[PDB]
């Protein structure tokens, strides 16, 4: 069988669904950013922008690290980088 | 600006968004199929299938022909079957 492959795929669709989410992915590409910083970049409160990065996490498609009071997010991996890249192009179509 | 391409990767997120929905496309790629055959394959009933489709074509993932009473979907081309690929290596994490 393909799952439980296509039910993950499915939260990394859920955590591209966002038109306003995806500008944290553009922000993120390339150089790691703390939640406060992504925030004020996206204009996004940081309740907003703490559930977006929720929601990216849980797509596997940005990670993070805490340090101190701050927590840092990045792009998981090369894979999601050429994914975004490749989502867009699809999308440009 | 980037927008309103960012708009666009939210719906094909969106389509994305579904695991069943995520059989379809296993099942096109690749070779075109009638609805009928679609909704058969996967175990679904005609107005699911066809609801799933809708949510696929939106997000620009297939395309549709309708021949007499027939409709035939087919993944919108290479780069819909390199995304689905790379999307799938993605979740595998």
Same mark, same amino acid.
């Given at each position: 069988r393909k799952a439980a492959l296509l039910d993950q795929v499915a939260r990394?669709?859920?955590a591209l669904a966002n038109g @306003? +989410?995806?500008?944290?992915?553009?922000?993120?590409?390339?150089?790691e950013?703390?939640?406060?910083?992504?925030a004020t970049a996206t204009g996004?409160?940081?309740?907003?922008?703490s559930a977006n990065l929720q929601a990216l996490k849980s797509g596997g498609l940005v990670e993070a @690290? +805490?340090?101190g009071?701050?927590?840092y997010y990045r792009i998981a991996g090369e894979d999601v980088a050429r994914l975004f890249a490749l989502v867009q192009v699809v999308a440009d179509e």
């Open positions: 990394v669709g859920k @306003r +989410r995806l500008q944290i992915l553009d922000l993120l590409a390339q150089g950013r703390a939640v406060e910083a992504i996004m409160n940081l309740t907003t922008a @690290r +805490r340090e009071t701050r927590q």
